[PDB]
């Protein structure tokens, strides 16, 4: 479950028994507006819009209202920020988490490609710490994907921002005197000019100390929920949901089928193509290629580590079954899309993987097996003459152990999402 430092955190905002409340010892009151969306699959995931009633207000207990020259403190949360697509967002800093009142306190704000921490004393001495990310990038680790934010403040030296458990930047704050923050914390888009802007946020916490790097890394690992497979955006991977595939070893290709049946094969076709709005973004197109759909071989539709599965593939508006004849000498087993009623004694059961038995994570998601739990190999690809055919290979399985590096079997499942819109190609 949650770490001890979470259980003893001074504000621990979580969904419990049908409501969002504070789990901390302080049990601060939470007021939720009428246009807040809670993800039905994972109600800890909170969506806040550019609308007046889309807000959450925390009424802090007096004991933890920040008023000090010396008390260290930190905040952590995950956020998912939709791609910026309007030029109106270019030079528009908007607050999202506000504890700044009467010229002192702290706030989290966003801007085009930015997450910003602002801290200010009662003399209005101010410091800012920023995380920048680009929208001019082939495949982004940050745009529209869940990222873990941690901000720590040591009153004697620095404020630091971490992203995904890793230090990004730090700025001195030792010149700041008494900081007297707000009695409340307002989660709300404030001053955003993009009327369609929203954020997703989850797992907000406040701590009354400077978290160290080990604690932050541990929080990151714990809150990642690694026993559950994730889609590209970082949401839970689901059964019966169409995903566009992205191979991390060769991102500039998409999955296609030359012909259906055992005489045909699955391969990576290129180029993937780009999407662009001048001065705003330039990225690889994500919504390309033949969709995979994950099929049950628990009633909640969430795909978990070690779940046995079938993979369906959508070709020309019809579903087929990923399968292969593994009885031949070659270690690489070429994958084909079969008519589902015609799969027969072909190998088709896949074990979904997020991590190994020792807890080590790996992006290699699909280990094809026979029907008795015996490995055929992780699904990746292999060049045959000029053609990068989809392949299952035990060579991958041997590589997973020795090294943590990206391999041909490393995949991402990308569902269509409101935070990433593409014009049609």
């Amino acid at each position, epitope marked *: 479950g949650p770490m001890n430092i979470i259980n003893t955190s001074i504000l621990n905002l979580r969904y419990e028994s049908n409501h969002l409340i504070d789990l901390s010892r302080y049990a601060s009151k939470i007021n939720i507006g009428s246009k807040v969306n809670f993800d039905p699959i994972d109600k800890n995931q909170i969506q806040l*819009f550019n609308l007046e009633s889309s807000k959450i207000e925390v009424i802090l207990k007096n004991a933890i209202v920040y008023n000090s020259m010396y008390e260290n403190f930190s905040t952590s949360f995950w956020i998912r920020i939709p791609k910026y*697509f309007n030029s109106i967002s270019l030079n528009n800093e908007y607050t999202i988490i506000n504890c700044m009142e009467n010229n002192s306190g702290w706030k989290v704000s966003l801007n085009y490609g930015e997450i910003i921490w602002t801290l200010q004393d009662t003399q209005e001495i101010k410091q800012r710490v920023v995380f920048k990310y680009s929208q001019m990038i082939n495949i982004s680790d940050y745009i529209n994907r869940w990222i873990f934010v941690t901000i720590t403040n040591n009153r004697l030296n620095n404020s630091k921002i971490y992203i995904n458990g890793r230090l990004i930047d730090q700025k001195p704050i030792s010149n700041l005197g008494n900081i007297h923050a707000s009695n409340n914390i307002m989660f709300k888009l404030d001053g955003c000019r993009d009327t369609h802007r929203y954020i997703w946020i989850k797992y907000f916490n406040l701590f009354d100390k400077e978290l160290n790097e080990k604690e932050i890394k541990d929080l990151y690992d714990n809150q990642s929920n690694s026993g559950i497979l994730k889609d590209f955006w970082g949401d839970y991977l689901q059964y019966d949901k*169409p995903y566009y595939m992205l191979n991390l070893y060769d991102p500039n290709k998409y999955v296609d089928v030359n012909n259906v049946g055992i005489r045909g094969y699955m391969y990576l076709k290129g180029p993937r193509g780009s999407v662009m709005t*001048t001065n705003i973004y330039l990225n690889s197109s994500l919504y390309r290629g033949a969709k995979f759909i994950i099929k049950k071989y628990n009633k909640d539709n969430i795909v978990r580590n070690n779940d046995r599965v079938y993979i369906n593939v959508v070709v020309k508006n019809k*579903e087929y079954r990923l399968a292969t004849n593994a009885s031949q000498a070659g270690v690489e087993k070429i994958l084909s899309a079969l008519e589902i009623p015609d799969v027969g004694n072909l190998s088709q059961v896949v074990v979904m993987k997020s991590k190994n038995d020792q807890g080590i994570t790996n992006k290699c998601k699909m280990n094809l097996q026979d029907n008795n739990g015996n490995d055929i190999g992780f699904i990746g690809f292999h060049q045959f003459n000029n053609i990068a055919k989809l392949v299952a290979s035990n060579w991958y399985n041997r590589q997973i152990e020795r090294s943590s590096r990206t391999l041909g079997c490393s995949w991402e499942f990308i569902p*269509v999402d*409101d935070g990433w819109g*593409e014009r049609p190609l």
Partner: nanobody
Amino acid sequence: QVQLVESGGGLAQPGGSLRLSCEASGFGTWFRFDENTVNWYRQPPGKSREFDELVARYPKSGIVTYLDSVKGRFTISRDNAKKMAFLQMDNLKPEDTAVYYCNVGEFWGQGTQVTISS
């Protein structure tokens, strides 16, 4: 063999109204209409699609957002059983002239011209 087909655009006078409609057909059972967001975009006259504006969005959550200039004038809606989406456009202005597009999930209509004559 799947398509979004749009209708209901064309010419109108300032202060007048139109209603755009959009229908999703041919989609296999893998496609769940209810799970998809319906959007209406418009392309400003004289500009490329890079200048497309999001006019209105209706996601599965039901929390609708509008372009600022159309707030109070345009209303978006959807019919999940009919697989349809609608854009009710009232009190039109010359600056509403544009090619309008229906977008459902990753799928797009071809575009429908709306022209407001001063």
